[PDB]
Design a protein around this motif. Structure first.
Motif, mmCIF file in Angstrom:
data_model
loop_
_atom_site.group_PDB
_atom_site.id
_atom_site.type_symbol
_atom_site.label_atom_id
_atom_site.label_comp_id
_atom_site.label_asym_id
_atom_site.label_seq_id
_atom_site.Cartn_x
_atom_site.Cartn_y
_atom_site.Cartn_z
ATOM 1 N N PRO A 192 9.527 15.408 9.371
ATOM 2 C CA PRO A 192 10.306 15.417 11.226
ATOM 3 C C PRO A 192 11.300 16.692 10.825
ATOM 4 O O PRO A 192 11.238 17.495 10.512
ATOM 5 N N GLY B 127 7.814 12.539 8.478
ATOM 6 C CA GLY B 127 8.473 11.604 9.291
ATOM 7 C C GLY B 127 7.305 11.670 10.581
ATOM 8 O O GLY B 127 5.976 12.032 10.506
ATOM 9 N N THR B 128 7.429 10.722 11.926
ATOM 10 C CA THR B 128 6.641 11.550 13.181
ATOM 11 C C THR B 128 6.548 12.908 13.623
ATOM 12 O O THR B 128 7.841 13.304 13.890
ATOM 13 N N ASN B 129 5.482 12.841 13.549
ATOM 14 C CA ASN B 129 5.358 14.826 13.770
ATOM 15 C C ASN B 129 4.194 15.198 14.847
ATOM 16 O O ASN B 129 3.669 14.330 15.378
ATOM 17 N N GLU C 200 -0.812 6.980 11.752
ATOM 18 C CA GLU C 200 -1.821 7.615 11.537
ATOM 19 C C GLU C 200 -2.642 8.979 9.801
ATOM 20 O O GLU C 200 -3.782 8.784 10.318
ATOM 21 N N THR D 141 -4.736 17.006 16.025
ATOM 22 C CA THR D 141 -3.533 15.574 15.343
ATOM 23 C C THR D 141 -4.374 15.359 14.758
ATOM 24 O O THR D 141 -5.830 15.459 14.633
ATOM 25 N N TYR D 142 -3.928 14.303 13.623
ATOM 26 C CA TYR D 142 -4.817 13.272 12.694
ATOM 27 C C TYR D 142 -5.228 12.435 13.546
ATOM 28 O O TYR D 142 -6.510 12.306 12.916
ATOM 29 N N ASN D 143 -5.032 12.612 14.379
ATOM 30 C CA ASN D 143 -5.993 11.571 15.997
ATOM 31 C C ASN D 143 -7.635 12.493 15.361
ATOM 32 O O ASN D 143 -8.840 11.641 15.520
ATOM 33 N N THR E 133 9.396 20.427 18.046
ATOM 34 C CA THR E 133 8.275 20.444 18.319
ATOM 35 C C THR E 133 7.951 21.846 19.137
ATOM 36 O O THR E 133 8.770 22.856 18.720
ATOM 37 N N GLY F 207 0.577 13.356 13.857
ATOM 38 C CA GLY F 207 1.017 12.049 14.679
ATOM 39 C C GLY F 207 1.924 11.135 13.523
ATOM 40 O O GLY F 207 3.252 11.489 13.362
ATOM 41 N N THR F 208 2.068 10.592 14.232
ATOM 42 C CA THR F 208 2.436 9.441 12.469
ATOM 43 C C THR F 208 2.322 8.849 11.215
ATOM 44 O O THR F 208 0.974 9.747 10.422
ATOM 45 N N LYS F 209 2.891 8.733 10.401
ATOM 46 C CA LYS F 209 2.828 8.506 8.647
ATOM 47 C C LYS F 209 1.554 8.064 8.515
ATOM 48 O O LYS F 209 0.915 7.741 8.415
#
Length: 417
Positions: A47, A65-67, A74, A21-23, A50, A70-72
């Protein structure tokens, strides 16, 4: 800028924390910065479907999109935190089709005029069919100004969220301006860093293809299958690559090029080309060391998934962390210092051996490790006694040769630490 991370990216080095993830990426940036990477590839921001990783590579749109990482927001935060390190945001994009059945995609791209409608049955020597056949998955009308406009709007969205550069899938199947295809102009106008996906040349013919590679590379830097071949072949057969770089030996400029330890594809689909998912860490890291050694060639490290089959590998996971290793760590700060200290490439002592003018050196044996007495390529590397950054053993450079005991990486590297 504690670890002296670069402005540049072609004269630069990259990680992909493949579907971390981005995170995850954001949190590890301190560590990634200590590990010396200036830049990070990331998967497409649209988007998506998954789970099975390629469902990100089959997005419904040319918009964020949220993906699956993560989100746009994030992503933006990752862009922000990267910029606190000054780290550079690279986004991978699949241009030449959206999700593999058109009925799922953006409604304004659904009409058949937005596609090369030739379908399957491509002759791999037929340059037009290679650039126009829907391989079960679609093939977009890439020369179409509105097809370029859709991608442009996405590239604008990406740069508006502070994306610093891009990678392009299927560049072999995208055209060039002499084939009527200004797509490359239509993305390079954003002033971003770029590179693109090609395997087996622009098509599988012998000759004239180099000039198609020139016309591509007038816009882009590119991958290499046949360097990837001799790499995988050599280092899996316990040999170093005899070539210094295949398409640059075919006369292409180094700033137009990229090589890898493995592509994500050579791990992430199925073993006939996914073969590296059953070939060792410290077999395949041998290729990464050679790649990143080359001056003005850009290079990337890859996080190996939790799994070894197309159906079995997924998005949204923290893959292998072997970048925390000595060898991967050394390679980056070595690039950071040896940028502009141009190289000489050789093979010596059963190793690729690479030497940086008034600067450091690298050694990469085909297999194993131990004492070496390799050629100083062109006499480039600075005479003196140093710690080998990889093993922590003492090594000595002389105007004719370099020597010392290589660690189990099979790789040795020196600089003014």
């Amino acid at each position: 800028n504690k670890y002296k991370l670069k402005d540049n990216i072609q004269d630069g080095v990259i990680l992909h924390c493949f579907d971390w993830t981005y995170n995850d990426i954001k949190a590890e940036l301190p560590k990634i910065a200590k590990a010396g990477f200036t830049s990070i590839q990331t998967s497409p921001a649209q988007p998506n479907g998954t789970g099975t990783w390629y469902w990100l590579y089959q997005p419904i749109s040319f918009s964020i999109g949220t993906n699956g990482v993560g989100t746009k927001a994030e992503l933006q935060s990752l862009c922000d935190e990267a910029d606190k390190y000054g780290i550079k945001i690279i986004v991978d994009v699949v241009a030449n089709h959206l999700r593999g059945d058109h009925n799922n995609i953006d409604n304004d791209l659904k009409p058949s005029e937005y596609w090369h409608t030739f379908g399957g049955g491509i002759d791999w020597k037929n340059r037009w069919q290679v650039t126009h056949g829907s391989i079960g998955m679609p093939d977009i009308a890439t020369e179409n100004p509105y097809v370029q406009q859709k991608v442009c709007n996405y590239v604008q969205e990406l740069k508006s969220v502070g994306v610093d550069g891009l990678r392009w899938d299927a560049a072999k199947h995208i055209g060039v301006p002499s084939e009527g295809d200004d797509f490359w102009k239509s993305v390079t106008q954003y002033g971003l860093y770029n590179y693109g996906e090609i395997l087996g040349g622009p098509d599988d013919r012998s000759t004239g293809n180099e000039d198609i590679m020139k016309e591509y590379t007038d816009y882009i830097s590119v991958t290499d299958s046949n360097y990837g071949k001799e790499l995988r072949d050599s280092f899996n057969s316990g040999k170093a690559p005899t070539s210094s770089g295949n398409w640059s030996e075919k006369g292409i400029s180094n700033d137009k090029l990229l090589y890898w330890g493995e592509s994500h594809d050579t791990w992430s689909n199925n073993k006939d080309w996914g073969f590296s998912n059953e070939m060792s860490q410290n077999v395949i890291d041998r290729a990464y060391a050679v790649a990143a050694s080359r001056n003005k060639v850009t290079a990337l490290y890859f996080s190996r998934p939790s799994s070894t089959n197309k159906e079995s590998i997924k998005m949204g996971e923290k893959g292998s962390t072997h970048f925390t290793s000595s060898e991967v760590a050394q390679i980056n700060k070595f690039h950071n210092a040896m940028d502009g200290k141009a190289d000489y490439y050789t093979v010596s002592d059963g190793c690729s051996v690479i030497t940086r003018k008034d600067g450091g050196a690298v050694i990469v044996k085909g297999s194993g490790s131990g004492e070496v007495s390799v050629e100083n390529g062109g006499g480039y590397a600075k005479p003196g006694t140093y710690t080998d950054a990889v093993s922590g053993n003492t090594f000595t450079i002389t105007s004719s040769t370099i020597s010392g005991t290589i660690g189990s990486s099979g790789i040795a590297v020196v600089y003014d630490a």
